[PDB]
Design a protein. Structure first.
Lengths: 208, 227
């Protein structure tokens, strides 16, 4: 079988710049195919036979390579070019490289939301921490309950990169039983992010 | 223009089989192979197999053999005889088979090989789960106070996807983030929708999130106010 290894995993660049994406095959001598997949859209063939552009593909997409090393070059990046790109040879595929929009670092605004009494009435407590409008996407959110770090009991979700301001938002949801919730006082989410000179903490005291 | 149109998304129970159709038109159906490929969350693309419509000869990915069957039907319309339908049936489904399935076809140029797929069906989402259809509970994420405040709605414990969320019946859109749903360990989905607004307005403006879950025929209007 052929193993295709794409890099980098994420590429951060601005409109107008040129992106270079790499695909290394475990076997040499075959031609390379590339696809574009914009978020939520059908995949689109870009390049076949290593360097030939598919139907309706603009000339700023340039495929090249030889042996085991293959490249997709995207000149003068357009807003639409920010997408995930996959390489293929025969039935084998790379795991994809994401091209994302670079912009200035932006610290998240952080908010914490205690669970509602109505949800508590039902036996479960959801505590939510919102990190709004930040860049880059990488952030560390730590839940602490009475200063004990919580792990394995929260789930995160992240928005798609905003099409206009290139920021992300993230939510982390700590889920506890009502009995567990009511045994502790201080609930806090600590956020660590490049845009912050030191970690930011938002918290509340249960029933206060 | 070549067109590949697939059958709609479906929810399947583990142990089930799913049969997906791909109506192909705009070219001579007998002249080109159709492939099937699946895009699996967190795992990427997996080629499933191909079928050649003339004799309906097939080739299945070694790792899927025994679970996949491809067949085709050729148009029986005398004044429109060149289109056809390709079918793929996938059996013994597990949650790991939850994916988006595509039928695809090669380009028709001289240097086009068999695997560069110029034409794609719109995809068919297959969710494999033992969960029962269930509408969401909606809970408030209440604003805690010039500055800007955040508020939202927690849409919890529904199946299957999707739920749609608007605010104030669509009149409020600026600053709304409705997060991708997460699958909880219970097998049920959950998401939040949040919005940032002026702290100044918290006493003057009303905020209502409108939640619609069509699979359960569930509609909820949740008014969210300061705690």
């Amino acid at each position: 079988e052929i193993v295709l290894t794409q890099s980098p995993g994420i590429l951060s660049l601005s409109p107008g710049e040129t992106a270079t994406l790499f695909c290394k095959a475990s076997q040499g001598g075959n031609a390379m195919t590339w696809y574009q997949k914009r978020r939520g859209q059908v995949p689109r063939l870009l390049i076949y036979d290593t360097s030939r552009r598919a139907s309706g593909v603009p000339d700023r997409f340039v495929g090249s390579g030889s042996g085991t090393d293959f490249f997709l070059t995207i000149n003068k990046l357009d807003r639409e070019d920010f997408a995930v790109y996959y390489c293929q040879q025969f039935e084998f595929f790379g795991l994809g490289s994401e091209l994302e929009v670079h912009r200035t670092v932006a610290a998240p605004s952080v908010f914490i939301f205690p669970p509602s009494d109505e949800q508590l009435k039902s036996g479960t407590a959801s505590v939510v921490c919102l990190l709004n409008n930040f860049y880059p996407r990488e952030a560390k959110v730590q839940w602490k309950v009475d200063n004990a770090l919580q792990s394995g009991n929260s789930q995160e979700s992240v928005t798609e990169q905003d099409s206009k301001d290139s920021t992300y938002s993230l939510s982390s949801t700590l889920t506890l039983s009502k009995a567990d919730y009511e045994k502790h006082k201080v609930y806090a989410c600590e956020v660590t992010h490049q845009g912050l000179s030191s970690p930011v903490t938002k918290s509340f005291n249960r029933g206060e | 223009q070549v067109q590949l149109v697939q059958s709609g998304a479906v929810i399947k129970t583990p142990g089930s089989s799913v049969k997906i159709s791909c109506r192909a038109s705009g070219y001579n159906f007998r002249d080109y192979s159709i492939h099937w490929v699946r895009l699996i969350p967190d795992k990427g693309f997996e080629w499933i197999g191909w079928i050649k419509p003339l004799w309906g000869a097939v080739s299945y990915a070694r790792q899927l053999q025994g679970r996949v069957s491809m067949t085709r039907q050729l148009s029986q319309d005398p004044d429109d005889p060149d289109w056809g339908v390709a079918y793929m049936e996938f059996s013994g489904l597990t949650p790991a088979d939850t994916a988006e399935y595509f039928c695809v076809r090669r380009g028709s140029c001289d240097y086009c090989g068999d695997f560069p797929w110029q034409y794609w069906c719109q995809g068919t989402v297959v969710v494999v789960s033992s969960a029962s259809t269930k509408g969401p509970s909606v809970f408030p994420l209440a604003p805690s106070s010039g500055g800007t405040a955040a508020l939202g709605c927690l849409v919890k414990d529904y199946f299957p996807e999707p739920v749609t969320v608007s605010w104030n019946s669509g009149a409020l859109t600026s600053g709304v983030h409705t997060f991708p749903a997460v699958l909880q360990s219970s097998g049920l989905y959950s998401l939040s929708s949040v919005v940032t607004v002026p702290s100044s307005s918290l006493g003057t403006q009303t905020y209502i999130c409108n939640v619609n879950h069509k699979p359960s025929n569930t509609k909820v209007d949740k008014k969210v106010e300061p705690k």
